[PDB]
Amino acid sequence: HFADFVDDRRATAAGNRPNYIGFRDNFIGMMYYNSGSNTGSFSSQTQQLN
Amino acid sequence: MEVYVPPPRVMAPTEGRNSISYNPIAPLQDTTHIYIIDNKTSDIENLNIHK
Residue A28 per-residue DSSP state? T
Residue B26 per-residue DSSP state? -
Resolution, given in Å to one decimal, reads 3.4
Is A35 an 8 Å CB contact of chain B?
yes
d(CA A1, CA A14): 6
Residue of A nearest to B48 (CA): A37
Query: What angle is formed at CA B28 by the lines to CA B23 and CA B30, rounded to 5 degrees?
Result: 155
d(CA A47, CA A41): 13
d(CA B20, CA B51): 31
One-letter amino acid at A5 equals F
Mutation target among A32, A33, A37 for the B interface, most CBs of B within 10 A? A37
Say if residues A36 and B47 touch (Cβ distance below 8 Å).
yes
Mutation target among B46, B49, B50 for the A interface, most CBs of A within 10 A? B46
Structure obtained using? cryo-EM
Q: List the beta strands (DSSP E) in chain A.
A: 2-5, 11-13
Is A45 an 8 Å CB contact of chain B?
no
d(CA B17, CA B29): 8
